[PDB]
Symmetry: D2
Subunit: 245 residues, 4 copies
């Protein structure tokens, strides 16, 4: 048994997670915190692990508190960068038995997409990422598309950059540059969370597309991380380290 708190409990993903923890036989909901609730509600309820689906402007402060209080964390909130991960590692030095897992996508199709993008990258001259999300999303590009681009760029270390003869452009047409990989962010009513990774070489392309049509797609990955969180003290990035790929 495990006492699980949710940060962002009234949000689109957090409300899904509250229902999932409540339904799980081996997990007990110990706290449901919304904006304006004090983090001390987590220690009042004897919370052992927290699920965080909040906002990029608040998640680092949530983590600072969770780590100082020895509460393990499964974080889906995005906005992460290498400097933020370094900061989380710095806080965890003081708390060597506390575990944090931060992943920009808990859906298995997105995890597989990032795995396949790493494997495909060296076979193609060009790579770009298009991500498409609902228009309530705070951050562009998405966490998943920034990680995918970073993985592709690492895989292509020492190979030529993408070819591109653009000489006349409007500002922003060619996307954001993430480690040399263009990333484009579409924000469209009707969508949930979607990504296409595009690879090209002479005469052919390969596209790896993931679509989450419902936030229920995030639940299995979050619950797996919650259940296994204390196995790996310190910081884990991504869900892939918990899987057999």
């Amino acid at each position: 048994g495990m006492r699980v708190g949710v940060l962002g409990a009234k949000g689109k993903v957090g409300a899904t997670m509250v229902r999932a923890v409540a339904a799980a036989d081996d997990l007990t909901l110990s706290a449901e915190l919304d904006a304006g609730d004090p983090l001390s509600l987590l220690t009042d309820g004897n919370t052992e692990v927290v699920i965080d689906f909040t906002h990029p402007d608040v998640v680092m402060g949530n983590l600072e508190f969770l780590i100082d209080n020895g509460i393990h964390a499964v974080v889906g909130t995005t906005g992460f960068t290498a400097e933020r991960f370094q900061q989380v590692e710095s806080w965890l030095v003081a708390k060597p038995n506390t575990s944090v897992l931060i992943a920009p996508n808990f859906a298995i199709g997105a995890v597989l997409s990032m795995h396949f993008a790493k494997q495909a990258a060296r076979f193609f001259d060009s790579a770009e990422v298009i991500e498409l999300h609902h228009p309530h999303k705070a951050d562009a590009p998405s966490g998943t598309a920034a990680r995918t681009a970073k993985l592709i760029a690492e895989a292509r270390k020492g190979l030529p950059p993408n070819p591109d003869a653009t000489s006349t452009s409007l500002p922003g047409a060619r996307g954001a540059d993430v480690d040399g990989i263009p990333v484009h962010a579409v924000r469209l009513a009707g969508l949930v969370a979607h990504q296409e990774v595009l690879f090209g070489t002479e005469g052919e392309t390969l596209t790896i597309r993931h679509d989450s049509l419902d936030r229920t797609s995030f639940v299995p990955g979050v619950l797996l991380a919650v259940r296994r969180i204390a196995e790996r003290p310190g910081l884990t990035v991504g869900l892939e380290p918990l899987l057999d790929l």
Copy 2:
């Protein structure tokens, strides 16, 4: 019978057009000009109409010469803007029997896409355009995607802008802004010319996608324009005015 010259005759599209004019029974090839050939080769050969698939940095000078010499023009080269079209109209005042048609896409699927985008626009909260071309293309976004965005924006005059809660972004992630419509330009080895128009509202999306897999797709539209060019003195923009839509 008609004496047709090609500007850009060694280019990817221009070489296709040379073969098409040579094959056509009712057209005679009167000039094939490449970079560094003087435009006087067109008047030397008694050229009546020219097909131009060259480069955005040279097409206005080609038009200035064609119009001054009363040679009708079918222009596929992109880079056009309202100011350039105004300039072409200004030159045509002096030459009231000369005809110019400038279109950013001669493929029927792209013409139909722009027509359907205009019809769909008022039914959706969000609209964006993704275009994807080979990595030798000079201009981003494409002529076709800029015209599509302009048509959507005109169709949505007086309706609310696209919803977008982005508050933290990398530069360029949200595309170029064409009259309030995001346009994203992918440049990928393997591609020819492709575009997706995306519309969204509560719970649903509509995507109109055109793919030219071969530059032969441009030939029917160019030959139609060549054959009908002298029907409309002055400037025609797009191929749609020659069609029954």
Copy 3:
């Protein structure tokens, strides 16, 4: 004000419609019938119009009762064919003030798709339809894909059939034949309701794709039909006749 009953009130779409009628200020929910509820509950509650999202094996019997009792009907259930529509018209002769509207898709993107497919059809050598739905769906192909194929085939009356050199095949690989147009039905966990209409000619294709990611996408079209149902006595097929296209 209008007294609206729902047939299929516990189903995936019907439960969405119950919530929508309950929320609407101008509509009153008069009956919510599930499998095994007698249709007399509709007359007991003084129902004026019914929304039907049930099953192909029961909808004709529901209509026979609704028409005999002068209750107008907005039907989304699929399984319809020309013979069934003829039967509905035959029953309506006896009840000249009763209105029935039967549509295989109430989402505006699907209505627009069918409208654009009709306009595009004569410009292309080939046309096919791919539809993709959740794996609880009873009927293949979908109502929407059969109507789209029928519209394309009517539009192409007198033009050559799709080209196809297939000489060796496994049974079923080339889809169902709807009036000469191949229709393919994908049934996949994760999906809701999706369709791609594909057109092809030399060197190019045009794809019109509609995606309903949530059954809320059907609500505006159903409520519009409910509100306008008594305007057109007799049978209306599709939602397009209520729109300005």
Copy 4:
């Protein structure tokens, strides 16, 4: 140096291969055979290896001759089945130094697609394959889509079948059944060779799409196989065994 013959030398792919062998510094074109040319032209020219892009009705007879004469073969022609591969293995028992490689796709994006489909299969409840080719293709479904389906089915040995509630259908709507995996074949003017592998589970899908826009995409894989053919005596199926995946 290597003496290479092409069977199907005037075909769409074979003409591409003739040009590639002629351009390669380490290969010499020893024969170019078209329909109605006798296979003895291969032995007359001292051919060491042949590339075969012909037709399903003739390739087994070509192989019977090639193997009996000790000529190694790189075969792209489709129509293969397990019984045909068993027959090729039976002929190779008599000729233990002769090598044959038969692959249904030599484009790296298709090879990678089949590799990723095998890795993804066990994570999803549903899987189907859509393939889309030009309308001159003899066989449906394609060789690549049949192999992809077979790989997915092998990967899912012991897992539940795809869910499917279909109870009313038109014949062929649900595709061909390849080892329990639906395969749908679109034949459309404008296309070259394309495939989408679709996987689904609760709330999400993963699509792996490969597009060959030009038959030049097949050349690198064929030349690699030609260059390495004698390394593996006997039969090799697919190009994957020559790669590091």
